[PDB]
């Protein structure tokens, strides 16, 4: 509350560390469905169904330009990528499986870096 604060967690490395995680997600062999924005002219249904499209290149641009206020808003966009994927793709598809694999990969790096 006013003049009453928990001890200050050091967040000075969060930017660099989110960048490193994002690099590792970019270079994963199953990243290919997520590298670029879904083409809304060429994928029927995507624009209407997926209210907030997100992809790794968009997160990279947001990260690089100070559009994440903190590490949690960064995690929310990464998770959005996978939530969107699950919304649009059957589990038993190459892209559906990719999304599960990448979400697992992310969540482990996230826990090991920050928890």
From Swiss-Prot:
Source organism superkingdom: Eukaryota
Please list the residue ranges annotated as the Bromo domain.
9-113
Protein location: Nucleus
Q: In which tissues is it expressed?
A: Expressed at varying levels in several tissues, whereas a smaller transcript was expressed specifically in testis.
How is the subunit organization of this protein annotated in UniProt? Answer: Component of the BRF-1 ISWI chromatin remodeling complex, at least composed of SMARCA1 and BAZ2B, which regulates the spacing of histone octamers on the DNA template to facilitate access to DNA. Within the BRF-1 ISWI chromatin remodeling complex interacts with SMARCA1; the interaction is direct. Component of the BRF-5 ISWI chromatin remodeling complex, at least composed of SMARCA5/SNF2H and BAZ2B, which regulates the spacing of histone octamers on the DNA template to facilitate access to DNA.
Q: Which family does it belong to?
A: Belongs to the WAL family.
Please explain the role this protein plays, according to its UniProt record. Answer: Regulatory subunit of the ATP-dependent BRF-1 and BRF-5 ISWI chromatin remodeling complexes, which form ordered nucleosome arrays on chromatin and facilitate access to DNA during DNA-templated processes such as DNA replication, transcription, and repair. Both complexes regulate the spacing of nucleosomes along the chromatin and have the ability to slide mononucleosomes to the center of a DNA template. The BRF-1 ISWI chromatin remodeling complex has a lower ATP hydrolysis rate than the BRF-5 ISWI chromatin remodeling complex.
Report what the protein is called.
Bromodomain adjacent to zinc finger domain protein 2B
What species is given as this protein's source? Answer: Homo sapiens
The taxonomy runs:
Eukaryota, Metazoa, Chordata, Craniata, Vertebrata
**Gene expressing this chain:** BAZ2B
Which residues of the parent protein does this chain contain? 2054 to 2166 of 2168
């Amino acid at each position: 509350s006013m003049s009453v604060k928990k001890p200050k967690r050091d967040d000075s490395k969060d930017l660099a560390l989110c960048s490193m995680i994002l690099t590792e997600m970019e270079t994963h062999e199953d990243a290919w469905p997520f590298l670029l924005p879904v083409n809304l002219k060429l994928v029927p249904g995507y624009k209407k169904v997926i209210k907030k499209p997100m992809d790794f290149s968009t997160i990279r641009e947001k990260l690089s330009s100070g559009q994440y206020p903190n590490l949690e808003t960064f995690a929310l966009d990464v998770r959005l990528v996978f939530d969107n994927c699950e919304t649009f793709n059957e589990d038993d598809s190459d892209i559906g499986r990719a999304g599960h694999n990448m979400r697992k990969y992310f969540e482990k790096k996230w826990t090991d870096t920050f928890k």
